[PDB]
Design an enzyme around this catalytic site. Structure first.
Site, PDB file in Angstrom:
ATOM      1  N   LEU A 101      -5.593  16.791   9.687  1.00  0.00           N
ATOM      2  CA  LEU A 101      -4.237  17.228  10.037  1.00  0.00           C
ATOM      3  C   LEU A 101      -4.256  18.639  10.593  1.00  0.00           C
ATOM      4  O   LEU A 101      -4.754  19.574   9.937  1.00  0.00           O
ATOM      5  CB  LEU A 101      -3.239  17.194   8.863  1.00  0.00           C
ATOM      6  CG  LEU A 101      -1.902  17.852   9.158  1.00  0.00           C
ATOM      7  CD1 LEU A 101      -1.079  16.957  10.036  1.00  0.00           C
ATOM      8  CD2 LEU A 101      -1.135  18.188   7.890  1.00  0.00           C
ATOM      9  N   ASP A 134      -0.433  11.501  13.907  1.00  0.00           N
ATOM     10  CA  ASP A 134      -0.699  10.546  12.836  1.00  0.00           C
ATOM     11  C   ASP A 134       0.521   9.630  12.590  1.00  0.00           C
ATOM     12  O   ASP A 134       1.538   9.616  13.309  1.00  0.00           O
ATOM     13  CB  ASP A 134      -1.210  11.126  11.510  1.00  0.00           C
ATOM     14  CG  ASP A 134      -0.210  11.956  10.739  1.00  0.00           C
ATOM     15  OD1 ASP A 134      -0.576  12.656   9.800  1.00  0.00           O
ATOM     16  OD2 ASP A 134       1.036  11.899  11.178  1.00  0.00           O
ATOM     17  N   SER A 153      -6.503   2.086 -12.742  1.00  0.00           N
ATOM     18  CA  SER A 153      -7.742   1.793 -12.033  1.00  0.00           C
ATOM     19  C   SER A 153      -8.721   2.926 -12.214  1.00  0.00           C
ATOM     20  O   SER A 153      -9.921   2.704 -12.319  1.00  0.00           O
ATOM     21  CB  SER A 153      -7.451   1.497 -10.567  1.00  0.00           C
ATOM     22  OG  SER A 153      -6.729   0.288 -10.501  1.00  0.00           O
ATOM     23  N   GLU A 161     -11.849   5.712   8.734  1.00  0.00           N
ATOM     24  CA  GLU A 161     -10.726   6.434   9.300  1.00  0.00           C
ATOM     25  C   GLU A 161     -10.748   6.437  10.795  1.00  0.00           C
ATOM     26  O   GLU A 161      -9.714   6.579  11.442  1.00  0.00           O
ATOM     27  CB  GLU A 161     -10.708   7.929   8.932  1.00  0.00           C
ATOM     28  CG  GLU A 161     -10.435   8.224   7.460  1.00  0.00           C
ATOM     29  CD  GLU A 161      -9.031   8.672   7.179  1.00  0.00           C
ATOM     30  OE1 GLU A 161      -8.537   8.496   6.088  1.00  0.00           O
ATOM     31  OE2 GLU A 161      -8.423   9.260   8.191  1.00  0.00           O
ATOM     32  N   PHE A 217      -8.988  10.963   1.427  1.00  0.00           N
ATOM     33  CA  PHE A 217      -8.819  11.145   2.829  1.00  0.00           C
ATOM     34  C   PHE A 217      -7.678  10.296   3.338  1.00  0.00           C
ATOM     35  O   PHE A 217      -6.867  10.704   4.170  1.00  0.00           O
ATOM     36  CB  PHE A 217     -10.065  10.787   3.652  1.00  0.00           C
ATOM     37  CG  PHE A 217     -10.949  12.011   3.894  1.00  0.00           C
ATOM     38  CD1 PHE A 217     -11.064  12.591   5.161  1.00  0.00           C
ATOM     39  CD2 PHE A 217     -11.677  12.618   2.867  1.00  0.00           C
ATOM     40  CE1 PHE A 217     -11.875  13.711   5.388  1.00  0.00           C
ATOM     41  CE2 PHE A 217     -12.504  13.733   3.065  1.00  0.00           C
ATOM     42  CZ  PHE A 217     -12.622  14.271   4.347  1.00  0.00           C
ATOM     43  N   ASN A 269      -7.951  -4.835 -10.438  1.00  0.00           N
ATOM     44  CA  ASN A 269      -6.732  -4.060 -10.502  1.00  0.00           C
ATOM     45  C   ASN A 269      -6.361  -3.469  -9.162  1.00  0.00           C
ATOM     46  O   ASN A 269      -5.198  -3.471  -8.748  1.00  0.00           O
ATOM     47  CB  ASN A 269      -6.836  -2.926 -11.572  1.00  0.00           C
ATOM     48  CG  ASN A 269      -5.485  -2.665 -12.234  1.00  0.00           C
ATOM     49  OD1 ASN A 269      -4.784  -3.631 -12.620  1.00  0.00           O
ATOM     50  ND2 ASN A 269      -5.106  -1.390 -12.358  1.00  0.00           N
TER      51      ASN A 269
END
Length: 164
Positions: free
Chosen positions: A32, A20, A117, A11, A104, A132
Site C-alpha cells: 500500500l 487496490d 483456528s 498476491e 499480507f 475450521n
C-alpha cells in the site's frame, strides 16, 4: 520455495502502480502506497520507498526489497500482538510463512480475529485447524489462495505450491 515466492504467487507481483480493492494506490506484492486519491502523491511515496525516481514503475528486485520490508513490519507487528505472538512463536518456519501470508492478505487485526483456528494451530491440531479454516469467510472469498495456505498449515511443507 520461500516466503517471497509464496506471496509472489498468492498476491501477485505488480511492477506498476495500481488501485487496490479499497481503491488505494498499491505496488509490488500488495504494498500500500497511500490512501490519498492523488496519483502524484502515490508517486512521491513510491520513490521514497524504493529509493529511486521511478515514475511509477519498479523492477522485480525492487519489489522484493519492498516485500522484505513488509515482512519485517509484519513480524514486528506480530510480536506486539497478544493474539498472534504465541501462535507465531510456536510455529515452525514454513507455517510462519503461511501465517504471514494471511497478514499480507487481510491485515494483522483481521488475522488476529481467527481466534479458534489460531488456537488449534498453536496446539499443533493441524487437521482440526484446516477444517475450521475451511468454514471461514476468507476461504469462501479467495478459495484458491486460502486452500494453499490451509494445506501449508496442515502439512508444514510447501507442497501446495509445487505445481501451479
Amino acid at each position: 520455495m520461500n516466503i517471497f515466492e509464496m506471496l509472489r504467487i498468492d498476491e501477485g507481483l505488480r511492477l506498476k502502480i495500481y488501485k487496490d480493492t479499497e481503491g488505494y494506490y498499491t505496488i509490488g506484492i500488495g504494498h500500500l502506497l497511500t490512501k490519498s486519491p492523488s496519483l502524484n502523491a502515490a508517486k512521491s511515496e513510491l520513490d521514497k520507498a524504493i529509493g529511486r525516481n521511478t515514475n511509477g514503475v519498479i523492477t522485480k528486485d525492487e519489489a522484493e526489497k519492498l516485500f522484505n520490508q513488509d515482512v519485517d513490519a509484519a513480524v514486528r507487528g506480530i510480536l506486539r500482538n497478544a493474539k498472534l505472538k504465541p501462535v507465531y512463536d510456536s510455529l515452525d518456519a514454513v507455517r510462519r510463512a503461511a501465517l504471514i501470508n494471511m497478514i499480507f492478505q487481510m491485515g494483522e487485526t483481521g488475522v488476529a480475529g481467527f481466534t479458534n483456528s489460531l488456537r488449534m494451530l498453536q496446539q499443533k491440531r493441524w487437521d482440526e485447524a484446516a477444517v475450521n479454516l475451511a468454514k471461514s469467510r476468507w476461504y469462501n472469498q479467495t478459495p484458491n489462495r486460502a486452500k494453499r495456505v490451509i494445506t501449508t498449515f496442515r502439512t508444514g511443507t510447501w507442497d501446495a505450491y509445487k505445481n501451479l
